[PDB]
Amino acid sequence: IALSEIVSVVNTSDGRIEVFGVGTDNAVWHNRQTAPHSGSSWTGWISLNGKVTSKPVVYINTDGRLEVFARGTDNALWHIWQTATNAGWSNWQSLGGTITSNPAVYVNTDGRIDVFARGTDNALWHISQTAAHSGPWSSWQSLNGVITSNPAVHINSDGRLEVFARGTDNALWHIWQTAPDSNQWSGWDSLGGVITSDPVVIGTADGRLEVFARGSNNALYHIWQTVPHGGPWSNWASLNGVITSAPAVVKNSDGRLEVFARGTNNALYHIWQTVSHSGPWSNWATLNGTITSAPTAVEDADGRLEVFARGTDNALWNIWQATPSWSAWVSLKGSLIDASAIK
Amino acid sequence: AAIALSEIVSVVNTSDGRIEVFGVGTDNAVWHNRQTAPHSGSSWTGWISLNGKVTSKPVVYINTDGRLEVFARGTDNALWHIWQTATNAGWSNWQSLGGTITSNPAVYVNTDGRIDVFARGTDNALWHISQTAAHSGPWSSWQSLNGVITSNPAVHINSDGRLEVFARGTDNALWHIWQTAPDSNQWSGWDSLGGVITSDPVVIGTADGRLEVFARGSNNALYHIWQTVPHGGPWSNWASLNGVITSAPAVVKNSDGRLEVFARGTNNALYHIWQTVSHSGPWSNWATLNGTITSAPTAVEDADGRLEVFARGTDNALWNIWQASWSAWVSLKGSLIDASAIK
Ligand SMILES: CO[C@@H]1[C@@H](O)[C@@H](O)O[C@H](CO)[C@H]1O
Ligand SMILES: CO[C@@H]1[C@@H](O)[C@@H](O)O[C@H](CO)[C@H]1O
Ligand SMILES: CO[C@@H]1[C@@H](O)[C@@H](O)O[C@H](CO)[C@H]1O
Ligand SMILES: CO[C@@H]1[C@@H](O)[C@H](O)O[C@H](CO)[C@H]1O
Ligand SMILES: CO[C@@H]1[C@@H](O)[C@H](O)O[C@H](CO)[C@H]1O
Ligand SMILES: CO[C@@H]1[C@@H](O)[C@H](O)O[C@H](CO)[C@H]1O
Ligand SMILES: CO[C@@H]1[C@@H](O)[C@H](O)O[C@H](CO)[C@H]1O
Ligand SMILES: CO[C@@H]1[C@@H](O)[C@H](O)O[C@H](CO)[C@H]1O
Ligand SMILES: CO[C@@H]1[C@@H](O)[C@H](O)O[C@H](CO)[C@H]1O
Ligand SMILES: CO[C@@H]1[C@@H](O)[C@H](O)O[C@H](CO)[C@H]1O
Ligand SMILES: CO[C@@H]1[C@@H](O)[C@H](O)O[C@H](CO)[C@H]1O
Ligand SMILES: CO[C@@H]1[C@@H](O)[C@H](O)O[C@H](CO)[C@H]1O
Ligand SMILES: CO[C@@H]1[C@@H](O)[C@H](O)O[C@H](CO)[C@H]1O
Ligand SMILES: CO[C@@H]1[C@@H](O)[C@H](O)O[C@H](CO)[C@H]1O
Ligand SMILES: CO[C@@H]1[C@@H](O)[C@H](O)O[C@H](CO)[C@H]1O
Ligand code: NA
Ligand code: NA
C-alpha cells in the first residue's frame, strides 16, 4: 500500500478549504483558510483532541456541518461534528464496532451519511445516519467480502453509492447499492488488475465513475464505467510514470481530471487531461519539493487546484495552481503523523 | 407594477454534464432540447415535445437521484409536474398537484432530498407543496406561508441548508421569508429588504456562502443586495450596477466564482457585466454581446467551465452564445412563447 495521504480536506460552505490531520499527540488537528481565495493565510492548527488510530476523514453534511470520522484507541469508530455550519464542535462520540481500516464516508441522496470500514474479519461493514444529517445511527451491517486495502466510496450519477477495495488476490473489487438510499447492496465483482495502493474514485464531468490506483510496476493505472452509472467497465489503462505514494485525483474547474503523486526523487508530480474532460492525458510533470506523504488535492473558491503534502520537517506544505506556473511551496507548519489504519 | 420581460426557458445541467433547456412551444406544450455532448459548442438533440398544455413558465429541477422534474401551471390553473422515471431516461405522464396558482412555480430541494415548490395563490399569498420523502411522493398538502406578493417568487438555499424565498410586495419592495431550520415546514415571518423593484428577484449563492439578489429598479438600472454574513444578516444596502435593462437579469457564477449578469438593453441586444479579478472583486463596465432578442437571457455554466447564454430571437427561435471573445450567435431553432404567469 503506497504512502498514504496524511490529511482529509473539505471545501466549507463559506468557500474556505479546511484540512484535518493527526498530530504527534494522536489528536486530530485542523487548519482552515482565513479567506476564500488562492494563497490565503491560514488560521493555524487547532486541536479537536481525541486519540485516533486511523486517518481522520471529514465529510460535509447536507446542512453544511462538517463531521470527522476516525478509528479510536478502543478500535471503535468515533465521530465529532459541528453543532452549526462552520461553528463549534461536539464532543467525540463512539459509534462502536471494531474496525481495521480508515473510514470511507459519503452521503446518500436522502442526506444520510454512510460510513464504510473493514472489520476484524476483513469484511466490509457500514453504519449510517437514520435521518438526514442526524442520528440516531443504524446498527453496523456486513457487506461481506475480504479486503486488503482501505475502502473508497463514491456516488453514481443515478444516486447509488459504490465501494472499491483491494481483494485477497490484490485485484480491485467493487460492490454497489441496488437503488439510492438502500441498505440492499449487490454482490462483490472483480475489476481485476494488480494494485499496490489504495484505490481512489471520482465522478467524471459526464457522469461515470473512474478509479485510479498504482500497479505492480509502480505506474499509475485507471479504469472507468463506459456508460453513466453502469457497465461495462473499461480495461485497465496505464498512465505510466513511476510513483512512490498513493495517487490523489481531483477535477479542475473545467472538468479536466488531474492526478498528483510522489515520484521516485521524492518530489510532487502531476498529470492531467488536456484540452477538455474528454481530452488525452498530458505527460507527467514535476512540481518539485521533497514530500514525505502522498499529496491531497482540492479545488479552491477561485477555481484553482490546491495541493497539500507533508514535508521533511513533518509540517504540512501547500502549492497551488497559479498561471502561467504553479505557486511557490509554502508551509502551513504543524507536525503531522501518518495514522492510516492500513499502510 | 412593471415586471421585466421574463426568461424564455428553464435550464439545468444533467447528471451526465449536458445542458438541457425547457420552454413553451406555440401549441402551449413544454418542449426540451439537450446537448448531444457535454462540451461548449456541442450540437443539440433538437426540440422534443413533453406535451401538456401550460400557462406558466415551466421550471425544471434535478432530484438528488439525478432525475429531472418539470413544474408548470396547467390550463386548469393547477400546478402540474412530469418527471424522468430514471436519470436522463424516459418521462412519466403529466400529473396534477392541484391548487389554483397565480405565479410561475419556484422550485428547490431541501437538504433531505425533498423538492419544495412555491407559488402565489388566488389570495396573492405564497403557498408551497413538497415531496414527503427524498426524490419521492407522496406530496404534502398545499400550505400557506401568508404574505401578499406582486411578482413571481424566487427560492434558494442558504449555506446552512435553510430555504429562503424572495418576492416583491404590495409596496414594490423586496420581501423575504426563510425556513427556521433545514427541511422545516416552519418559516419566519415576512421581512422587508426595501428598495423599489420592477422585476422578479433573481437569487444566487456566492462562492463564500452568502445569498445575493439582483433586480431591476425604478430607473431600469440593475441593482443588487446581499447577506453580509454567511446565511445571516444584516443585509447590505442596495447597490446600483447602472445600465438600462429591458428584460429580467440572468445571474450566474463563472468557473472561478466571479458573478456575471446578462440582460437585454434598449436596442434589444444582449449585454453583460461581471466581477473582475476574483469573486471578491469590483464589477466591470457593461459590454454588448450584440444579437436582437425578444426575451430575457438565461445563463448556465457548461461541463467545460464556460458560460452559455440562451435567449429568444426575432424569429422566436432559441439562440445561443457562449464564453469562447465570445462565440458567434447560433440558432437552436424552435418557436417559443412567453407563458410567464405574471408579466
Ligand atoms: C476519539 O478519541 C478517544 C478514543 O480513541 C478513546 O480513547 O476514547 C476517548 C474518550 O474516552 C476518545 O476521546
Ligand atoms: C464493525 O465492527 C464489528 C466487526 O468488525 C465484527 O467484529 O463484528 C461485530 C459485530 O459482531 C462488528 O460490530
Ligand atoms: C440573436 O440575435 C439575432 C436573432 O434574433 C436573429 O435576428 O438573427 C440574428 C442573426 O441573423 C441574430 O443576431
Ligand atoms: C446534530 O447531528 C449529529 C449528526 O451530525 C451526527 O452524525 O450524529 C450525532 C449523534 O449521533 C448527531 O447528533
Ligand atoms: C472481495 O472479497 C473477496 C475477494 O477478496 C476474494 O479474492 O474473492 C472473493 C470471492 O470468492 C471476494 O468475495
Ligand atoms: C492494474 O493492474 C495492472 C494490469 O492492468 C496490467 O496489465 O499489468 C500491471 C502490471 O503493472 C498491473 O499492475
Ligand atoms: C448497476 O450498475 C453497476 C455499476 O454501478 C457498477 O459500477 O458496475 C456494474 C458492472 O460491473 C454495474 O452493473
Ligand atoms: C492545462 O492546464 C494545466 C493544469 O491543469 C496543470 O495543473 O498545470 C499545468 C501547468 O501549469 C497546466 O498546463
Ligand atoms: C498539527 O501539528 C501540531 C502543531 O500545531 C502543534 O503546535 O504541535 C504539535 C506537536 O508537535 C503538532 O502535532
Ligand atoms: C400539463 O398539461 C396538462 C395535461 O397534461 C392534462 O391532460 O390536462 C391539463 C388541463 O386540464 C393540462 O394543463
Ligand atoms: C418517482 O418519484 C416521483 C417524484 O419524482 C415526483 O415528485 O412525484 C411522483 C408522484 O408522487 C413520484 O412518483
Ligand atoms: C410580503 O407581504 C406583505 C407586503 O406585500 C406588504 O407590502 O407589506 C406587508 C406587511 O405590511 C407584507 O406582509
Ligand atoms: C436567520 O437568518 C436570516 C437570513 O436567512 C435572512 O436572509 O436574513 C435575516 C435577516 O433579515 C436573517 O435573520
Ligand atoms: C474576465 O472575464 C470576462 C468574462 O467573465 C466575460 O464573460 O467576458 C469578458 C469578455 O470576454 C471577459 O473579460
Ligand atoms: C419548440 O419549438 C417548436 C418546434 O420545435 C416545432 O418544430 O414546431 C413548433 C411549432 O412552431 C415549435 O413551437
Ligand atoms: Na442556522
Ligand atoms: Na438606468
Short mmCIF file of C-alpha atoms in Angstrom, two decimals, chain A residues 45-237:
data_model
loop_
_atom_site.label_atom_id
_atom_site.label_comp_id
_atom_site.label_asym_id
_atom_site.label_seq_id
_atom_site.Cartn_x
_atom_site.Cartn_y
_atom_site.Cartn_z
CA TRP A 45 -3.51 24.33 13.60
CA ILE A 46 -6.19 23.92 16.28
CA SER A 47 -6.76 20.64 18.19
CA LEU A 48 -10.05 18.69 18.21
CA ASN A 49 -8.47 16.36 20.83
CA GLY A 50 -9.33 12.66 20.71
CA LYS A 51 -6.85 9.82 20.31
CA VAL A 52 -7.04 8.17 16.89
CA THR A 53 -5.52 5.15 15.11
CA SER A 54 -6.73 5.93 11.56
CA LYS A 55 -6.56 8.79 9.12
CA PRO A 56 -9.35 11.18 10.21
CA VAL A 57 -11.99 11.57 7.45
CA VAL A 58 -14.06 14.77 7.26
CA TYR A 59 -17.35 14.93 5.36
CA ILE A 60 -19.76 17.88 4.89
CA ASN A 61 -23.34 17.10 5.93
CA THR A 62 -26.05 18.38 3.52
CA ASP A 63 -26.75 21.27 6.02
CA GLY A 64 -23.06 22.35 5.74
CA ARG A 65 -21.97 20.93 9.16
CA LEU A 66 -18.55 19.26 9.00
CA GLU A 67 -18.22 15.85 10.66
CA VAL A 68 -14.99 13.87 11.27
CA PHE A 69 -14.80 10.06 11.49
CA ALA A 70 -11.82 8.16 12.92
CA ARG A 71 -10.81 4.85 14.48
CA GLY A 72 -10.25 5.23 18.26
CA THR A 73 -7.75 3.53 20.56
CA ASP A 74 -10.55 1.01 21.51
CA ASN A 75 -10.85 0.13 17.75
CA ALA A 76 -14.38 1.62 17.60
CA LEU A 77 -15.49 4.18 15.01
CA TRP A 78 -15.65 7.61 16.70
CA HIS A 79 -17.01 10.88 15.31
CA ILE A 80 -17.23 14.58 16.16
CA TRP A 81 -19.39 17.17 14.39
CA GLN A 82 -20.02 20.88 14.10
CA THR A 83 -23.19 21.84 16.05
CA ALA A 84 -23.82 24.57 13.40
CA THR A 85 -22.28 25.03 9.90
CA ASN A 86 -18.68 26.25 10.35
CA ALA A 87 -19.28 26.78 14.10
CA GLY A 88 -18.34 24.96 17.35
CA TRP A 89 -17.77 21.20 17.61
CA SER A 90 -19.46 18.46 19.67
CA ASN A 91 -17.56 16.09 21.97
CA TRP A 92 -16.22 12.87 20.42
CA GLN A 93 -18.87 10.09 20.48
CA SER A 94 -18.49 6.35 19.82
CA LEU A 95 -20.43 4.55 17.06
CA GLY A 96 -18.97 1.26 18.38
CA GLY A 97 -17.87 -1.57 16.12
CA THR A 98 -14.32 -2.93 15.78
CA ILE A 99 -12.66 -1.59 12.60
CA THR A 100 -9.35 -2.33 10.90
CA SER A 101 -9.18 0.36 8.14
CA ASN A 102 -9.62 4.06 7.63
CA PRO A 103 -13.31 5.01 7.36
CA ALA A 104 -14.72 5.78 3.89
CA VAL A 105 -17.55 8.30 4.04
CA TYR A 106 -20.26 9.51 1.63
CA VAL A 107 -23.80 10.92 1.82
CA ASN A 108 -26.88 9.23 0.35
CA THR A 109 -29.33 11.19 -1.87
CA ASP A 110 -31.61 11.49 1.25
CA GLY A 111 -28.92 13.35 3.22
CA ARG A 112 -27.98 10.29 5.39
CA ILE A 113 -24.17 9.83 5.83
CA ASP A 114 -22.99 6.23 5.21
CA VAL A 115 -19.66 5.15 6.75
CA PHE A 116 -17.72 2.11 5.49
CA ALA A 117 -14.81 0.35 7.22
CA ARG A 118 -13.06 -3.00 7.22
CA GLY A 119 -13.96 -5.21 10.21
CA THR A 120 -11.97 -7.62 12.40
CA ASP A 121 -12.97 -10.40 9.91
CA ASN A 122 -11.54 -8.27 6.98
CA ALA A 123 -15.11 -7.88 5.59
CA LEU A 124 -16.55 -4.52 4.56
CA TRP A 125 -19.01 -3.16 7.17
CA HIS A 126 -21.12 0.02 7.19
CA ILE A 127 -23.21 2.16 9.53
CA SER A 128 -25.45 5.13 8.59
CA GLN A 129 -27.42 8.12 9.85
CA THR A 130 -31.14 7.11 10.00
CA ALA A 131 -32.34 10.67 9.15
CA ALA A 132 -30.88 13.49 7.04
CA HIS A 133 -27.71 14.91 8.69
CA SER A 134 -28.94 13.40 12.02
CA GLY A 135 -28.87 10.50 14.43
CA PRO A 136 -29.81 8.08 15.62
CA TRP A 137 -27.32 5.88 13.73
CA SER A 138 -28.12 2.38 12.39
CA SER A 139 -26.51 -0.82 13.62
CA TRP A 140 -23.31 -2.00 11.93
CA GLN A 141 -24.16 -4.25 8.92
CA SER A 142 -21.73 -6.51 6.99
CA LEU A 143 -21.33 -6.24 3.21
CA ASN A 144 -19.07 -9.36 3.36
CA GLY A 145 -16.01 -9.69 1.10
CA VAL A 146 -12.39 -9.96 2.27
CA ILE A 147 -10.36 -6.79 1.61
CA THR A 148 -6.71 -5.81 1.93
CA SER A 149 -6.78 -2.02 1.29
CA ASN A 150 -8.67 0.89 2.78
CA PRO A 151 -12.09 1.09 1.08
CA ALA A 152 -13.06 4.03 -1.18
CA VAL A 153 -16.67 5.18 -1.77
CA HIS A 154 -18.35 7.47 -4.31
CA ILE A 155 -21.93 8.01 -5.53
CA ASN A 156 -23.01 7.07 -9.05
CA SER A 157 -24.66 9.73 -11.22
CA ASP A 158 -28.04 7.93 -10.53
CA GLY A 159 -27.64 8.25 -6.72
CA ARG A 160 -26.30 4.69 -5.96
CA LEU A 161 -23.30 4.51 -3.58
CA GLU A 162 -20.44 2.24 -4.71
CA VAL A 163 -17.39 0.97 -2.79
CA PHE A 164 -13.99 -0.09 -4.14
CA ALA A 165 -11.28 -2.07 -2.29
CA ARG A 166 -8.36 -4.40 -2.99
CA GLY A 167 -9.13 -8.11 -2.54
CA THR A 168 -7.18 -11.14 -1.30
CA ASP A 169 -5.82 -11.59 -4.89
CA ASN A 170 -4.60 -7.91 -4.96
CA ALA A 171 -7.22 -7.20 -7.68
CA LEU A 172 -9.67 -4.29 -7.47
CA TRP A 173 -13.16 -5.38 -6.28
CA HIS A 174 -16.40 -3.35 -6.02
CA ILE A 175 -19.92 -3.53 -4.63
CA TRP A 176 -22.86 -1.11 -5.14
CA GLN A 177 -26.22 -0.05 -3.78
CA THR A 178 -29.08 -1.59 -5.84
CA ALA A 179 -31.07 1.70 -5.52
CA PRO A 180 -30.43 5.15 -3.99
CA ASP A 181 -30.61 5.31 -0.15
CA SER A 182 -30.84 1.46 0.05
CA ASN A 183 -29.29 -0.88 2.64
CA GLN A 184 -29.54 -3.59 -0.11
CA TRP A 185 -26.22 -3.96 -1.97
CA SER A 186 -25.04 -6.08 -4.93
CA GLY A 187 -22.65 -9.00 -4.71
CA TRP A 188 -18.92 -8.29 -4.99
CA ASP A 189 -17.48 -8.10 -8.53
CA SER A 190 -13.84 -8.20 -9.62
CA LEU A 191 -12.39 -5.43 -11.84
CA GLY A 192 -9.13 -7.46 -11.95
CA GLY A 193 -5.71 -5.84 -12.21
CA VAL A 194 -3.00 -5.93 -9.54
CA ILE A 195 -2.94 -2.80 -7.36
CA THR A 196 -0.25 -1.61 -4.99
CA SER A 197 -2.05 1.40 -3.48
CA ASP A 198 -5.46 2.20 -2.10
CA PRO A 199 -7.85 2.94 -4.95
CA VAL A 200 -9.27 6.48 -5.38
CA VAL A 201 -12.57 7.07 -7.19
CA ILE A 202 -14.06 10.19 -8.79
CA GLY A 203 -17.09 11.08 -10.90
CA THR A 204 -16.28 12.39 -14.40
CA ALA A 205 -17.91 15.54 -15.81
CA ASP A 206 -20.07 13.19 -17.96
CA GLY A 207 -21.42 11.10 -15.03
CA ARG A 208 -19.12 8.00 -14.98
CA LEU A 209 -17.10 6.57 -12.09
CA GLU A 210 -13.34 6.40 -12.73
CA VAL A 211 -10.82 4.66 -10.41
CA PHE A 212 -7.06 5.34 -10.10
CA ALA A 213 -4.51 3.10 -8.39
CA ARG A 214 -0.80 2.26 -8.53
CA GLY A 215 0.01 -1.01 -10.36
CA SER A 216 2.63 -3.82 -9.85
CA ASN A 217 5.27 -1.86 -11.89
CA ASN A 218 4.57 1.33 -9.77
CA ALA A 219 2.89 3.02 -12.80
CA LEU A 220 -0.41 4.89 -12.40
CA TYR A 221 -3.39 2.94 -13.78
CA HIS A 222 -7.07 3.86 -14.24
CA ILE A 223 -10.31 2.12 -15.17
CA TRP A 224 -13.83 3.56 -15.72
CA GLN A 225 -17.50 2.92 -16.27
CA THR A 226 -18.11 3.20 -20.07
CA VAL A 227 -21.83 4.13 -19.55
CA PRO A 228 -23.10 6.67 -16.96
CA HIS A 229 -23.72 4.79 -13.65
CA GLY A 230 -23.31 1.45 -15.43
CA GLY A 231 -21.20 -1.19 -17.11
CA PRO A 232 -19.31 -2.43 -18.79
CA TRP A 233 -16.11 -1.15 -17.16
CA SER A 234 -13.16 -0.39 -19.45
CA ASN A 235 -9.98 -2.43 -19.43
CA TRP A 236 -7.31 -1.05 -17.11
CA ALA A 237 -5.12 1.56 -18.87
#
